[PDB]
Write a protein that holds these residues in place. Structure first.
Motif, short mmCIF file in Angstrom:
data_model
loop_
_atom_site.label_atom_id
_atom_site.label_comp_id
_atom_site.label_asym_id
_atom_site.label_seq_id
_atom_site.Cartn_x
_atom_site.Cartn_y
_atom_site.Cartn_z
N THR A 1 0.83 -1.19 0.00
CA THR A 1 0.00 0.00 0.00
C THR A 1 0.87 1.25 0.00
N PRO A 2 0.35 2.37 -0.51
CA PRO A 2 1.14 3.61 -0.53
C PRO A 2 1.21 4.35 0.79
N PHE A 3 0.72 3.77 1.89
CA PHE A 3 0.77 4.46 3.18
C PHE A 3 2.21 4.64 3.65
N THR A 4 3.11 3.75 3.24
CA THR A 4 4.53 3.89 3.49
C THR A 4 5.28 3.68 2.19
N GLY B 1 7.30 1.72 0.72
CA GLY B 1 7.87 0.39 0.63
C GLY B 1 8.60 -0.07 1.88
N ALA B 2 8.06 0.22 3.05
CA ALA B 2 8.71 -0.17 4.29
C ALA B 2 8.57 -1.67 4.52
N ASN B 3 9.49 -2.22 5.31
CA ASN B 3 9.45 -3.62 5.71
C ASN B 3 8.81 -3.70 7.09
N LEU B 4 7.74 -4.47 7.20
CA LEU B 4 6.94 -4.51 8.42
C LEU B 4 7.06 -5.87 9.09
N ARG B 5 7.26 -5.85 10.41
CA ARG B 5 7.42 -7.08 11.17
C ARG B 5 6.08 -7.79 11.34
N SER B 6 6.14 -9.11 11.45
CA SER B 6 4.96 -9.95 11.59
C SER B 6 4.98 -10.62 12.96
#
Lengths: 49, 49
Positions: free
Chosen positions: A39-42, A44-49
């Motif tokens: 999504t364009p909210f960030t 292209g950040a990498n998000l932890r699961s």
């Protein structure tokens, strides 16, 4: 009484509380995994699961 | 939504489409027979059949 406490013993109770706080947090953080944002909210950040 | 595409992936999809365009055209043209035409507009030509 069940709704009262002895005021002359607050320091003793507080001191034991602080020791419990430290002991409960003696852990090591662990690397789980990541995923890229679709999504364009960030940007292209990498998000932890 | 099943309709619509993510605008963040347009370049990736377009590049794959162009690769498909090249791969499907890897052929050699094959010689075949002709015919002598005498239509008044193309008199004497040898059209491929």
């Amino acid at each position: 009484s069940v709704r009262g406490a002895n005021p002359l013993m607050f320091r003793a109770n507080v001191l034991h509380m602080l020791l419990e706080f430290v002991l409960d947090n003696l852990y090591l953080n662990r690397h789980t995994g990541f995923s890229q944002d679709h999504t364009p909210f960030t940007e292209g950040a990498n998000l932890r699961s």
